[PDB]
Write a protein that binds this ligand. Structure first.
Ligand code: HEM
Ligand SMILES: [Mg+2]
Length: 453
């Protein structure tokens, strides 16, 4: 078959379609119009956007297709280097670091992180316990404080102390501002224009701020010899079983910057969208609050108790189904191949998986794809293979998935145990896009249930 293509802009082809603050929502609208596959052209590049489970299952065959670095990740590589997220599968450092870090991210390894996750979660609950009657909560802002602080403590035993601040720690300001530069670089008609000399100087400054902190903490840890429950201790001590080599200090720095840069925002967006869906769907809020009350019977949650929050886990999977917070990933054809029996591809051709549209495939999910129904995930053996992919695919799938889901389960369970929530503004969903998705402006009021910590 011949391939559908959205509207074009002369010699700029389709490129201006992405000159928007909300490009993935734009592409989802295009997908709705054009169907399971469409071509997208820009000066010097071409990709094909996939939306159906039928085609994405094929794209996810690792014998045929491998991870490609899409446009904003190639710029993120300027500060995350050959850390796990911005390396190619075939670079030595990718596999070395994957083999070293995998056991440190396993479900079993969560038992070792649990206490530092509860440290930051208790800080969030005390913050909200201490609001006055007429105050409200800025939900994505607080979730972001929580997720940055939790990855800082678990990643490198460092406190960003985000709940002590309106202006984040300078490392966070630099990283946030670097991620924004990466995104903003994509939308520049004249990348070399002198108007951007300032953005380029600030970008180098921010890279320097990030490296200087992380390098110093690494050096401090080597100089002290201290052994903590964090990823930095694991990286200092670890050898790749296959090569026999450890990670060098530069790459350990890239991994630390990568866990913060890749993980914080997608996890804070998940928590913010799950609370959004529960305040809009009070019967599901009640089910999840009843479960948190029945299960979280102790003043702080244990690892075992967090595992028993099945309905909270169902709520978080259904929020990932609707708004997977790292919404698109890119692949390339390893050799010439035919996609879906219809679309011939040459070696090197690019594909993009649009995960919000895969999760709205009506042939898989049924017709009510916009409705929030946690019970879709009651028994996850019902879900066909390759239908639900919020954490990507295969060996290049999110290494932080058990971390994110333990964090979000813990924190949402505690939120639901300790407070009732009110959507006092009747908030209108407005999804902001960075590297990730979140509900911008989402606010609520909490009313404490007056349960001790
Ligand atoms: C709900 C929260 C999260 C979601 C939805 C999510 C989603 C994703 C997705 C879709 C990918 C694949 C990207 C691609 O193919 O280009 C990815 C990769 C990755 N994520 Fe996550 N992520 C989340 C949380 C985290 C956290 C908490 C961490 C770290 C503590 C993390 C670290 C990573 C890394 C290091 C990669 C690269 C893995 C590799 O290629 O070896 N993520 N994530
Ligand atoms: Mg309903």
């Amino acid at each position: 078959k011949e391939m559908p293509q959205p509207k074009t802009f002369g010699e700029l082809k389709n490129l201006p379609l992405l000159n928007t603050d909300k490009p993935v929502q734009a592409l989802m609208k295009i997908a709705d119009e054009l169907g399971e596959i469409f071509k997208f052209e820009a000066p010097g590049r071409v990709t094909r956007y996939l939306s159906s489970q039928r085609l994405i299952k094929e794209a996810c065959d690792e014998s045929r297709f491998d991870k490609n670095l899409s446009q904003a990740p190639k710029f993120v590589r300027d500060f995350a280097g050959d850390g796990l997220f911005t390396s190619w599968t075939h670079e030595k450092n990718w596999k070395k670091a994957h083999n070293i870090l995998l056991p440190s991210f396993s479900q079993q390894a969560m038992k070792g992180y649990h206490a530092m996750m509860v440290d930051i979660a208790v800080q969030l609950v005390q913050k909200w316990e201490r609001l006055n009657a007429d105050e409200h909560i800025e939900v994505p802002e607080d979730m972001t404080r929580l997720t940055l602080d939790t990855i800082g403590l678990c990643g490198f035993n460092y406190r960003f102390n985000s709940f002590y601040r309106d202006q984040p720690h300078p490392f966070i300001t630099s990283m946030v501002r670097a991620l924004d530069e990466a995104m903003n670089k994509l939308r520049r008609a004249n990348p070399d224009d002198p108007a951007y000399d300032e953005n380029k100087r600030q970008f180098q400054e921010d890279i320097k701020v990030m490296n200087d902190l992380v390098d110093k903490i690494i050096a401090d840890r080597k100089a002290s010899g201290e052994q903590s429950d964090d990823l930095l201790t694991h990286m200092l001590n670890g050898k790749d079983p296959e090569t026999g080599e450890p990670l060098d200090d530069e790459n350990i720095r890239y991994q630390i910057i990568t866990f913060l840069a890749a993980g914080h925002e997608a996890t804070s967006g998940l928590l913010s969208f799950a609370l959004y869906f529960l305040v809009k769907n009070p019967h599901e809020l009640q089910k999840a609050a009843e479960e948190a009350a029945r299960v979280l019977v102790d003043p702080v949650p244990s690892y075992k108790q967090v595992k028993q929050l099945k309905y909270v886990g169902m709520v978080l999977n259904e929020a990932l189904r609707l708004w997977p917070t790292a919404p698109a990933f890119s692949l390339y054809a390893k050799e010439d191949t035919v996609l879906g029996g219809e679309y011939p591809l040459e070696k090197g051709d690019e594909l993009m998986v649009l995960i919000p549209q895969l999760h709205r495939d009506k042939t898989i999910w049924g017709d009510d794809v916009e409705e929030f129904r946690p019970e879709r995930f009651e028994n996850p053996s019902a879900i066909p293979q390759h239908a639900f992919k919020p954490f990507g695919n295969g060996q290049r799938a999110c290494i932080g998935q058990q971390f994110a889901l333990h964090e979000a389960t813990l924190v949402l369970g505690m939120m639901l145990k300790h407070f009732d929530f009110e959507d006092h503004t009747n908030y209108e969903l407005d999804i902001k896009e960075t590297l990730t998705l979140k509900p911008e402006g989402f606010v609520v009021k909490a009313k404490s249930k007056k349960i001790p910590l």
